[PDB]
Amino acid sequence: HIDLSALNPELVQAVQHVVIGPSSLIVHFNEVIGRGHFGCVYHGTLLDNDGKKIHCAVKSLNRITDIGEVSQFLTEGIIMKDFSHPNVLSLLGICLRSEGSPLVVLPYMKHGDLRNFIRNETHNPTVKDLIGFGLQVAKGMKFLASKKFVHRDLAARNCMLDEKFTVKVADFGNKTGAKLPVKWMALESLQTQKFTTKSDVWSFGVLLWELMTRGAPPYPDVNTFDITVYLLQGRRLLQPEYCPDPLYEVMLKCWHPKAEMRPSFSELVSRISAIFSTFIGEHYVHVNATYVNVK
Numbered sequence: 530h531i532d533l534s535a536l537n538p539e540l541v542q543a544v545q546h547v548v549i550g551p552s553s554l555i556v557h558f559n560e561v562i563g564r565g566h567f568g569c570v571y572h573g574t575l576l577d578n579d580g581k582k583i584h585c586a587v588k589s590l591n592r593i594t595d596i597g598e599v600s601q602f603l604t605e606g607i608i609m610k611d612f613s614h615p616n617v618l619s620l621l622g623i624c625l626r627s628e629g630s631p632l633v634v635l636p637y638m639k640h641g642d643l644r645n646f647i648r649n650e651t652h653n654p655t656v657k658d659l660i661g662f663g664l665q666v667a668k669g670m671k672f673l674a675s676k677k678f679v680h681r682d683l684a685a686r687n688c689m690l691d692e693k694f695t696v697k698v699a700d701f702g703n704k705t706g707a708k709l710p711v712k713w714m715a716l717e718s719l720q721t722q723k724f725t726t727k728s729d730v731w732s733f734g735v736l737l738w739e740l741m742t743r744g745a746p747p748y749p750d751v752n753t754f755d756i757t758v759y760l761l762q763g764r765r766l767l768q769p770e771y772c773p774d775p776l777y778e779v780m781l782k783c784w785h786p787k788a789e790m791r792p793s794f795s796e797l798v799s800r801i802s803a804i805f806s807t808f809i810g811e812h813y814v815h816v817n818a819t820y821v822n823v824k
């Protein structure tokens with residue numbers, strides 16, 4: 530009971546060559562997983578004719594609450610329509626029955642988010658495993674940069690991990706909000722709320738740190754918004770105990786004060802693939818006692 534067809538002429542006719550028939554996809558509402566706020570992600574299974582099956586993630590939101598921030602839901606998940614990279618979260622399809630709230634469907638990521646996975650104490654990552662995860666994000670990021678796509682919120686909490694341990698870059702979902710992830714933000718974005726690919730590089734450097742500390746919160750002591758004063762003092766995150774020297778050097782390049790002096794994602798894949806190849810997988814990374822329980 531909503532005059533939908535009023536979204537966009539040759540702009541939102543996308544849900545078409547992207548939609549799928551419920552005649553091949555079920556929904557399991559009881560068992561959940563996603564509920565950080567909006568998009569009450571569930572579970573589900575799609576079908577590929579007579580045999581091929583598949584597990585999934587289904588996130589949705591409100592309804593009769595007008596369409597203002599409701600069209601930005603369909604238009605967000607559609608952003609993935611042309612995101613075909615092993616290291617980037619993909620769009621399975623789109624289906625909205627003649628009475629079912631705005632439904633978004635994604636492939637299931639068994640190991641959840643990169644940050645929770647690495648913080649898990651029953652897991653025993655090696656320096657190599659972690660450098661490998663960073664290399665995969667760099668690869669997906671290189672794809673996105675190639676599309677002139679600006680992420681704006683690159684963080685380990687926003688990367689997914691599947692059953693083969695393939696990292697998928699994503700976004701679990703304004704230039705002055707408190708929700709602004711200022712601790713991943715480059716100096717120039719904190720000052721002028723402008724985001725670029727060079728500002729995702731700075732953020733990538735912080736993600737490498739989260740990786741080498743196994744999900745430690747950055748700048749714990751400065752639990753604020755006023756990180757700009759702290760940074761302009763001549764400060765940077767410190768080298769984690771298990772982070773190789775050549776890798777911390779890459780991090781400091783990512784945090785170059787001059788955005789254009791920062792390496793490109795293509796240079797990062799290159800530099801990190803080299804550092805990664807030198808490891809055999811005999812170095813275990815342990816959790817820092819002073820970061821334990823720190824949020």
Ligand SMILES: Nc1cc(Oc2ccc(NC(=O)NC(=O)Cc3ccc(F)cc3)cc2F)ccn1
Pocket residue numbers: 562563568570585586587588605606608609612617618633635636637638639641673680689698699700701702
């Ligand atoms: N266990 C499990 C939980 C899951 O939760 C979710 C996790 C993430 C999303 N993200 C989303 O809706 N879209 C994108 O991220 C769009 C996008 C893609 C690439 C970019 F670079 C920027 C934005 C939705 C979820 F449901 C999914 C699968 N398995």
